[PDB]
Amino acid sequence: MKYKIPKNFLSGFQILSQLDKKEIEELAKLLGELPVGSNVQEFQSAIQTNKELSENALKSADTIFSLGGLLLEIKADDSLNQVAEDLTNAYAKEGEEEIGTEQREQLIHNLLIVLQKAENLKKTFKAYRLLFENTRSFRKSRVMTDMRMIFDDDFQKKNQTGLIIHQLKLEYIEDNTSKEFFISLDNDDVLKLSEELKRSLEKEECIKRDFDQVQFINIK
Amino acid sequence: MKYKIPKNFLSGFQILSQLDKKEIEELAKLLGELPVGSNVQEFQSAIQTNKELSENALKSADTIFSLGGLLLEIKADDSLNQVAEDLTNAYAKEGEEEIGTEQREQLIHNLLIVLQKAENLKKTFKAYRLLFENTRSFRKSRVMTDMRMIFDDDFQKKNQTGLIIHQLKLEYIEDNTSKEFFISLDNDDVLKLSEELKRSLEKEECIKRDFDQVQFINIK
Amino acid sequence: MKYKIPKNFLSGFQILSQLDKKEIEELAKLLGELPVGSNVQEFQSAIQTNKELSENALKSADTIFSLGGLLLEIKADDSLNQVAEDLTNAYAKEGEEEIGTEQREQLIHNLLIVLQKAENLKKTFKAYRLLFENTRSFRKSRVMTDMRMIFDDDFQKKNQTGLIIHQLKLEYIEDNTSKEFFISLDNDDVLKLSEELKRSLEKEECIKRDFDQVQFINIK
Amino acid sequence: MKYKIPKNFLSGFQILSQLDKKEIEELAKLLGELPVGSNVQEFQSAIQTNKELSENALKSADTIFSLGGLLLEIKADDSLNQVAEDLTNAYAKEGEEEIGTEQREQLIHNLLIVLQKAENLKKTFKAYRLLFENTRSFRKSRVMTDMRMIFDDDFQKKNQTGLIIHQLKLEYIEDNTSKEFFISLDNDDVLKLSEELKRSLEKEECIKRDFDQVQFINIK
Amino acid sequence: MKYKIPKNFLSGFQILSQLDKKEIEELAKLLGELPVGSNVQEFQSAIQTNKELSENALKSADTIFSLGGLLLEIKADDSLNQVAEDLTNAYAKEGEEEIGTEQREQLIHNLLIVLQKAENLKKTFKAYRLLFENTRSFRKSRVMTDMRMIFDDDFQKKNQTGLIIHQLKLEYIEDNTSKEFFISLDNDDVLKLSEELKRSLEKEECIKRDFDQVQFINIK
Amino acid sequence: MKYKIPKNFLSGFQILSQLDKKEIEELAKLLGELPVGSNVQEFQSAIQTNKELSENALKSADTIFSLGGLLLEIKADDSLNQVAEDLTNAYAKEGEEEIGTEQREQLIHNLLIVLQKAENLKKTFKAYRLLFENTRSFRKSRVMTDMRMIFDDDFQKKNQTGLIIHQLKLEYIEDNTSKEFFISLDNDDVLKLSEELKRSLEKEECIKRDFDQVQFINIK
Amino acid sequence: MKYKIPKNFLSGFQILSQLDKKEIEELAKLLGELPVGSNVQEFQSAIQTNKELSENALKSADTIFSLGGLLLEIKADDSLNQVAEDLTNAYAKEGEEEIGTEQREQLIHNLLIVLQKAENLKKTFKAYRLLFENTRSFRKSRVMTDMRMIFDDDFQKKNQTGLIIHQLKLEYIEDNTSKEFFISLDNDDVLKLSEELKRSLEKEECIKRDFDQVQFINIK
Amino acid sequence: MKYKIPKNFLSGFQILSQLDKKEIEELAKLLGELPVGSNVQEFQSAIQTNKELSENALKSADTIFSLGGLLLEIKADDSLNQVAEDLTNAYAKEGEEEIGTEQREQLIHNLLIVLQKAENLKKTFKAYRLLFENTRSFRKSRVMTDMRMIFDDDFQKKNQTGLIIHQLKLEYIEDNTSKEFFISLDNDDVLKLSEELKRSLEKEECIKRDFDQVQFINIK
């Protein structure tokens, strides 16, 4: 490729020397049957739930899931086999080994075996990419609590005033980088967020109720 | 003053020519009895709930509440009567009228009558100032909803993929100015905010339970 | 209101003293029939195309369109008549006239006559608001042209090198304020933008082709 | 030099031990004949299209193209041979080898052989530098598509309103760093950009038509 | 002038119709004797401490102090009388009155009478300008106090941990505009600032001790 | 873990092979008795002040203090033993050694022995985290001194004007990064800061006087 | 227009009621003869140098120069007479007077009389606009001087070290707004700027020498 | 130290094993005689101009100059020998070798031999630090040239208008980082900068003329 491949992806390149045909075609069938929209760990669950497949195929299947995104980040208008040939040539140029017709044939044969089945996986990784493809996004947050006190011009007095200052901390991404953001509240606004969000939840319930022809994704 | 006084505050300066002693002292007593931490509209409610006071005093009482903050934003270490004299002189310098001993005496007499009672009101306006006295604060927010669609490289296909992209818009202040801030979500994170806020609410319940010697303010 | 009303909106308040019932109900009927999503000038066209209505109603109808947004920016969960009463009271407080039962009744009667018909107009102004309700938006742009020249270390030579440096200037809004933004190009990139935009246009053609149950807005 | 030379440039320093005179002078002749304004890959094409040159010269020729910019970024008012001597001394100071008269002579001889021919290449690299030498520049962009939906206060209704919100994403450089920039559109503005750009293209056609004495560069 | 003169400065232009020679020359003498570096209020004190001068001259003397800066912001290399003539012509162009030889002569005569004495005042206003002539400067600050509390994972426990978080707020100017700046502390750092500043104060004492030939300004 | 552990923390993992029970339980007892809120160096002092403990335990105790924060940064709602198991599994995945039941048992046994005692240490590290958990914080500052001079339009004169321009430099953190900030002063403002800070110090004295039930932390 | 016209431009609208034909055509001839690229004050000089024209025409001629830019900022592709008609209609809509055929005819007749001659003036105002049409531009600058002193750890020593720290202040515009920018120097760099600028000046001399067919503008 | 020492500074630590007393004391004498304010290359010149010193001492003398800054960046109030002991202990902690009394004694003996002579060098490095110790500073700049052309609405015309748009590019530092800054000019402003700078140069000449008791530094 024009990109450098560490063993996180080269592992498959090295391990592709034994895997056979029935197992790969059956896995393609299963993935076509697999509920589209699964995470890498979900694919690990699917693999571990196997009974017809050998344990050796697992060394790359989880990586194939990651390689799928690299395989499915590929441009659609570009020919699949031609792109495979180009990336194989570039990899051999900067790869760990010079490729003869034997390993080249095994690689490209398995590759076309894969892309022929990536409809579900193509859709899954398209879905995964898009949810982030905005200006900024979300990870997590907390809240804190204060009990600030009020000091008189007469320090000898008993201070007997109390407060509740909620705080909020959100975790959000821009340009593939993390940041912080802080803000101040009070009780009423808290209730108001809460009620508003609950009613939003009802709205999703209604939209879920409406469309039957579309199954809605729940990906993280 | 060094500050210019429009009729929002000069109205009292002009209207102070008739109000008598019993009404002002009784109002001071009531305010001392008034639950510390009331807003201007709450003071309007207290005034309208009156039965011993004349209607004429109302022309400034609501303004006295606003003048109280101007009266209670005053520096504590500075002598009350001396500060009154200085501000009266500066106002007469740039005010609507040159002050003789008559109006000056009425003004300063009523002033000392007021500051002698501003303990509750001093505390109230101190409280009001502080909650904002941070780097930034809060007014309001909304949410929206999208139903983005997914387009294939084969436009002739039925598009059958659906999404739910919540949006958030917060209203927050810096340097006495307003702004906006926008962000992206998904269902799980919504539930997570909701649960976290509910548990925060429980925390306030516990802290409320603990301290009996302090009555906690609920000011907006 | 809490907002001050100049004659851009007070004009209706002043002019509401003569308009009758048949004309207003017929205009409501027409607006219900009016293609939802029309601009103020489109409403002016609709008005000028009238034959059953008097010319006098025009003094506010165009303003009603603007007042509609102020009438339709109103919060939905708040009762229509109660909100009308509150805004009428606040306006009378700071308005040009104190309102008796006569003008108050005429105003509120016409108001409820209007809000009873604002479904199309509510939808229109919701639509108008939303397209802008993002982080930033668009007005206009240009391009320029340069013919920079290349100077040798030998100034006595004939300079015979030529260039074409397109420039771009976009007009965009943040926080209700305008700005500028500038950038550099070359021929290929120009062709590339052009082709990409044309293919986008085809995409809209396809989506337009798909959905028959939804009529898509073309508002500016 | 004062700059450190990795093998991307030191490779020539190491490989200069065999190349002969006829090949270098013929390559200088060819480059003088080479259409001024070629990229490194274009120079690679020119090299691979060779028939009189040995394959060994290629190890640095492509680097000479890159070294040319380092050789042609050099200040013009500074003497060529004196600058060569200074940079050779500094490199020997921090280089991979201490230079005797033999390698020093080979290096400086080849250097003066090169700079004697860099008129075309000097012009080319001047041209390459300048197009970027502004406040900010360009790489690429995309567009997206939305199909936002409109929700009533009556959720039980069929939502039948549709929209088309194009989006734009430009890739631009400041201070040798990349960024993003986002914006909102609608159909008309799209057509308007398109027509405006087409007419700009016509303008280049006219200017191309006018000047015959100047051949205009098309460099990327 | 090219600048517009309101009555803050036009007042002198209007009031210059009566003042005589002995008073102005004696005031020039006094100002030459006046301790260089006085503020406008200090000049007011000097004026009010007068016994030989008429009260009428005061209407502009305080403004002359302000006009002095406008008179001493003037460029030094430009001829004093020529600059006076130019500014008088421009003012008459956009002033409240067209100037004949009479008022023109009175104005310019008094002007040259003034600039002939502005050595002390020139130095004073130069001094005043410079202290601000940096990137940013100072007005004021405060501190606050917190008593944050520590909440356990076991809310039923008595919270018995205490803190002291000083805060700081500085007031500083850039581009003739004000801002804020906030920061966090603890006790040790407070002591450290305090000791460091005290030792700085000693340093000024030493430098004050050293130079006898220079009297150091204390201007605000 | 999901985080990589260098020998700053892996040292304990490697050294945990000999430490016994009485020493660890006695150290837990001591730490419970240790004044909550001690720094790593304070824990080193506590360790070196030992007489019942072996010297070998010291190899990790100081690291346990650092590991405590990593152990006490852990989420409270997550089960202690389950989190220990998860982190042990992940570490064994990317650790220096694959863990059998022997080292796993020793590790987890000691771990539960520790977390059973971390109340004081949990509170300490919570305290340590929080003081920084704001928008920005403090390290240090200096001051400088100038003796700027005043130059006349007559350079032949003796310059005899003197000044004192204090400067300030603060060291403050945002986003775990350092910066600078500079500002200008004069004598009065210096005195004013000094007096204000002294009076703040008195305020802490008063608050210290008030609450007896809470011991206030002095951590750096 | 869509823009509001104050008397800075409405003055011509009001004063156009007397001017005749010979004077306007002769002024058009003169302007065609006028050296293209003159400022408003240069046009004032040209007017005052008149002998065939009446003094009354001057009331707008200087404004015509300003109106020319408003007349020449007009879009070229739009028909001149049609644009005149549109702007006249809009002005009459929001102007000081409703226009009959008489004043409308006088206005439009004079307008077409003007635009028929604006070739020189069109070029002039195009030129004026462009020089600013970049990201930022220039007004002015200064320099200052320091004589900082060096303080020992032994304050009793004679300080005998001296420095020269030039400073620079530039005045530059972005988005039609002014700013500042500051920087630090030393003697050598000063000489270097000076020499570099002088050699640049020589470069302009050479380019001036080269092209005879083009007269270069010197506009401010 | 708390800082890590690479061989740029550890080289002296390793090479200090042979240097003798007479050479170091004579070099201290020479440096005391050396014109205070010399750069590292100036010290190299001084060293190479030696005749009494051995060549071996040169391996660190140039580094001593750099180590001097590290030796003279040291805090003045801290005891020299105590600081030496602390830094030696910390270095031995993280250094290349554990230090016995022999190398420790040689190191500390030479160290005290050095600091006893660093008055000139202390002053030099203080001077070096300060000139940069502002908000931002300077390296270099250029200028460019344009010959923009003016295009008519009638493209068939001969374009015969010419311009001269100087450009400026400055190189300046903030927070130890580099940047750019760009700006637009014209001929007059160029002359104006030039004249202003020349007159500034005269000002330095005058100040140089005035003070004889202070020798002014010229450091780069």
Tell me the two tokens of residue D12: 């020539």
Method used to determine the 3D structure: cryo-EM
Going by their DSSP bridges, the two strands C215-216 and D161-162 should be labelled as parallel
Residue B180 in contact with partner chain C when CB distance is under 8 A: yes
Contact A13/A95 with Cβ under 8 angstroms? yes
- Three-class DSSP category at G92: helix
Give CA–CA dist H87/H81, Å, rounded. 10
What are the structure tokens assigned to A98, written together? 């010079």
d(CA H126, CA G161): 11
**Contact status, residue F111 vs residue F70, Cβ threshold 8 Å:** no
Give D171's DSSP letter: E
E 69-98 near F (Cβ less than 8 A): 76
Concatenating the DSSP letter of every residue in A2-61 gives: -S---HHHHHHHHHTTS--HHHHHHHHHHHHHS-SS--HHHHHHHHHT-SSS-GGGHHHH
D197: Cβ contacts below 8 Å, ≥ 6 apart: C143, C190, C193, C194
Contact H35, H23 (CB under 8 A): no
Q: Do D183 and C172 touch (CB under 8 A)?
A: yes
Q: Where are the alpha helices (DSSP H) in C49-162?
A: 58-72, 80-94, 101-115, 119-132
What is the rounded distance in angstroms from the CA atom of residue E152 to the CA atom of residue F119? Answer: 10
Phi-psi region of B175 (alpha: psi -120 to 50; beta: other; left: phi over 0): left
- Give all chains having 3 or more CB-to-CB distances under 8 Å with chain D: A, B, C, H
Say how far apart CA G215 and CA G204 lie, in whole Å: 13
**Quick check: C12 and C63 in contact, CB under 8 A?**
yes
Q: Closest to A155 (Cβ–Cβ): which among F135, F175, F203?
A: F203
Question: Which structure tokens are listed for B202?
Answer: 């429980």
The residue assigned the tokens 């830019």 is: G69
What phi and psi, each to the nearest 5 degrees, are found at residue F161? -110, 140
Chain A positions touching E149 (Cβ under 8 A) are: 145-147
Mode of pairing for the β-strands spanning H181-184 and G181-184: unpaired
* Chain C CA closest to residue H144: C151
Give chains near H: 3+ CB pairs under 8 A.
C, D, F, G
The separation between CA A132 and the C-alpha centre of its own chain, rounded to angstroms, equals: 9
The C-alpha of C87 sits at a distance from chain B's nearest C-alpha, in angstroms, of: 17
Q: What are phi and psi of G158, to 5 degrees?
A: -75, 120
Mutate to test the interface with B, among D147, D150, D165 (most CBs of B within 10 A): D147
How far apart CA F158 and CA F156 sit, in angstroms, is 7
Question: What is the helix (H) or strand (E) element at residue E95, kind and residue range?
Answer: none
Token pair 């015509």 is at which residue? G64
Distances G148 to D80, F146, G145, H136 between C-alpha atoms, Å: 42, 6, 10, 17
State the distance between the two ends of chain B, measured CA to CA, in whole angstroms: 30
CB E57 within 8 A of CB E43: no
Single-letter amino acid, residue A210: D
C2 touches chain H (CB under 8 A): no
Any residues with CB less than 8 A from the CB of G97 and at least 6 apart, and which?
G103
C-alpha span between G41 and G55 (Å, rounded): 17
Question: Hey, which chains touch A, using 3+ CB pairs under 8 Å?
Answer: B, D, E, F
Taking residue C18's Cβ as centre, other Cβ atoms within 10 Å add up to 10
For residue C194, give every residue at least 6 positions away whose Cβ sits within 8 Å of its Cβ, in sequence order, or none.
D194, D197, D198
G194 CB neighbours in chain H (<8 A) are 194, 197-198, 201
Check A147 against E145: CB less than 8 A apart: no
Q: What b/e readout covers D114-138, taking b as 16+ CB neighbours within 10 angstroms?
A: bbebbebbbbbbbbbeebeebbebb
- Among C164, C148, C152, CA closest to D120: C152
Within an 8 Å CB–CB cutoff, is residue G181 touching chain H? yes
Characterize G6-22 residue by residue with b for buried, 16 or more Cβ atoms within 10 angstroms of its Cβ, and e for exposed.
Answer: eeebbbbbeebeebeee
The pair phi, psi for residue G51, each rounded to 5°, is -135, -20
Distance set, CA F20 to CA F10, F43, F54, F105 (Å)? 19, 20, 10, 14
User: How would you class B68 by CB atoms within 10 Å of its CB: exposed for 0-12, middle for 13-18, buried for 19 or more?
Assistant: buried
Task: At D184, give phi and psi (nearest 5°).
Answer: -125, 150
In three-state secondary structure terms, A132 is helix
Physical contact, G and C (3 or more Cβ pairs within 8 A): yes
Distance CA F166, CA F178 (A): 23
B165 DSSP assignment: -
Chain A environment of D144 (Cβ under 8 Å):
133
Give the residue among A28, A117, A126 at the shortest CA–CA distance from A75: A126
Cα–Cα distance, D180 to D169 (Å, whole number): 7
Continuous H helices in B49-186: 58-72, 80-94, 101-115, 119-132
B155 to chain C: closest CA residue: C206
Residue G15: name the closest of G49, G59, G48 by CA.
G59
Distances from the Cα of A140 to the Cαs of A65, A172, B188, H136, in angstroms?
26, 8, 11, 38
Per-residue b or e along B21-39, where b marks 16 or more CB atoms closer than 10 Å to that residue's CB? eebbeebbebbeebebbbe
List chains touching F (3+ CB pairs under 8 A).
A, E, G, H
Residue F155: which of H135, H175, H206 has the nearest Cβ? H206
H8-34 burial code (b ≥16 CB/10 A, e <16): ebbbbbeebeebeeebbeebbebbeeb
Whether C65 contacts C43, CB under 8 Å: yes
**Does B136 reach chain A within 8 Å, measured CB to CB?**
yes
HSE-up of residue C148 (Cα within 13 Å, Cβ side): 20
| Contact status of C119 with chain D (Cβ, < 8 Å) | no
- Report which secondary-structure segment, H or E, holds B14: helix B7-15
Do A170 and A143 form a contact (C-beta atoms < 8 A)? no
Size of interface F-H (CB pairs under 8 A): 9
- Nearest-neighbour CA in chain G from H17: distance (Å): 33
State which residue of chain F sits closest to A167, comparing Cα positions.
Answer: F134
**CA quadruple E85, E86, E90, E95: dihedral sign:** negative
CB-based burial label for F144 (10 Å; 0-12, 13-18, 19+) = middle
Contact C30, C46 (CB under 8 A): yes
The pair of structure tokens assigned to F215 is 């011991």
For chain E, how big is the Rg over CA atoms in Å? 26
Contacting F residues, span 189-218, partner chain E, CB-CB under 8 Å: 189-190, 193-194, 196-198, 200-201, 203-204, 207, 211, 213-218
Pairing relationship of beta strands E137-144 and E167-174 according to DSSP bridges: antiparallel
* Cα distance between residue E183 and residue F137, in whole Å: 6
Residue by residue, what is the 3-state secondary structure of A13-25? Answer: HHHCCCCCHHHHH
Distances (CA, A) of E9 to C117, E62, E68, E71, H118: 61, 10, 11, 11, 60
Q: Which of D138, D143, D184 sits opposite C183 (nearest CB)?
A: D138
The neighbour count for residue C186, using CB atoms within 10 Å, is 18
Distance CA H181, CA A197 (A): 48
Q: How far apart are CA G170 and CA H182, in angstroms?
A: 12
The pair phi, psi for residue E52, each rounded to 5°, is: -95, -15
Between helix A101-115 and helix A21-33 the angle, nearest 10°, is 20
DSSP string, C40-59: HHHHHHHHHT-SSS-GGGHH
Asked if residues B189 and A138 have their Cβ atoms less than 8 Å apart, the reply is yes
Reduced to 3 states (helix: H, G, I; strand: E, B; else coil), residue F170 is: strand
Residue of chain F whose alpha carbon sits nearest to that of G144: F151
Question: CB of D16 within 8 A of CB of D106?
Answer: yes
Q: CA of C114: how far to CAs of C43, C55, C82, D157, E176, in Å? A: 15, 19, 15, 22, 51
Give CA–CA dist B123/B118, Å, rounded: 8
Tokens encoding F35: 């004044």
- Decide: A217 and A123 in contact? Cβ < 8 Å: no
User: By CA distance, what is D205's nearest residue in H?
Assistant: H155
Q: Which of F155, F157, F172, F181 should one mutate to test binding to chain H, selecting the residue with the greatest count of H CBs within 10 A? A: F155
Write the Ramachandran bin of D175: left for phi over 0, alpha for psi from -120 to 50, otherwise beta. left
CA A209 to CA E187: how far, in whole Å? 61
3-state secondary structure of F95: coil
Closest CA to H149 of H166, H135, H163, H136: H163
CA A148 – CA A165 distance, rounded (Å) = 8
Looking at the complex, does the CB of residue F151 fall below 8 Å from at least one CB of chain G? yes
Q: How many CB atoms lie within 10 A of CB C94?
A: 11
3-state secondary structure of G82: helix
Nearest to E160 among F161, F184, F213 (CB): F213
Task: Calculate Rg over the CA atoms of chain G.
Answer: 26
Burial classification of residue H114, based on how many CB atoms lie within 10 Å of its CB (0-12 exposed, 13-18 middle, 19 or more buried): buried
Indicate the DSSP class of residue H177. Answer: E
In single-letter form, the type of residue at position G42 comes to E
E167: number of CA atoms within 13 Å, CB side? 15
Contacts of F201 (CB under 8 A, 6+ apart): E190
Which residue among G76, G141, G187 places its CB closest to the CB of H218?
A: G187
How far apart are alpha carbons H74 and H81 in whole angstroms? 12
- Which residues share a beta bridge with H168? H143, H183
Q: Using only C-alpha atoms, what is the Rg of chain D?
A: 26
Amino acid, res. E127: A
Q: Do the bridges between strand E215-216 and strand F161-162 make them parallel or antiparallel, or are there none, so unpaired?
A: parallel
- Residue H183 to residue G141: CA distance in whole angstroms: 13
CA–CA separation, C31 and C61 (whole Å):
11
